[PDB]
């Protein structure tokens, strides 16, 4: 339906951005091997959080993941999130 299949967007999570997140965490010096390892971690976070949201969607029969889908999913992973409803 008017083109939607996705590319390889994990490299979109650039070394600049991983470096900035490490900076917020008060990290001073970063090894070469962090950035790829970080993307693995990030991917596995997102895979788990979206699987569960996507479930809550498929149950309510929708084809549109709501913020509440993501909220309910995050509370499930013990990662309660404030300021998007619920």
């Amino acid at each position: 339906r008017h083109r939607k299949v996705l590319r390889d967007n994990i490299q979109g999570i650039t070394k600049p951005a991983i470096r900035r997140l490490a900076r917020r965490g008060g990290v001073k010096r970063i090894s070469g091997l962090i950035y790829e390892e970080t993307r693995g971690v990030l991917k596995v976070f997102l895979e788990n959080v979206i699987r569960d949201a996507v479930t809550y969607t498929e149950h309510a029969k929708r084809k549109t993941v709501t913020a509440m889908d993501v909220v309910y999913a995050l509370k499930r992973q013990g990662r309660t999130l404030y300021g998007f409803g619920g």
Binding site: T55, Y56, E58, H59, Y72, R76
Partner: protein, 96 residues
């Protein structure tokens, strides 16, 4: 007299004799199996309770249970768990 406290034990024993008809079980072991069943029953019902609640529905149905189970058990175990809960309902419907 002496209270009258229910438990899943007579069923834990029945399943055991399906999977291993000559092996037995200690009271501490049967206490862990009773702790195990009650734990997950509360897990699956609570996640159904909420499912239903999030979708403004009054009834927990077998569908809520099956969505709760995708959520609670890990991939390969959810798969058999659905497969068995589906099959049991089909068989139950089929009978009457």
């Amino acid at each position: 007299k002496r209270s009258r406290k229910e438990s899943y034990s007579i069923y834990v024993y029945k399943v055991l004799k399906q999977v291993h008809p000559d092996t037995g079980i200690s009271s501490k072991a049967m206490g862990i199996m009773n702790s195990f069943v009650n734990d997950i029953f509360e897990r699956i019902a609570g996640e159904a309770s909420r499912l239903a609640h999030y979708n403004k529905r009054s009834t927990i149905t077998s569908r809520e249970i099956q969505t709760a189970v995708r959520l609670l058990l890990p991939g390969e175990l959810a798969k058999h768990a659905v497969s068995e809960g589906t099959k049991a309902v089909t068989k139950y419907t089929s009978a009457k």
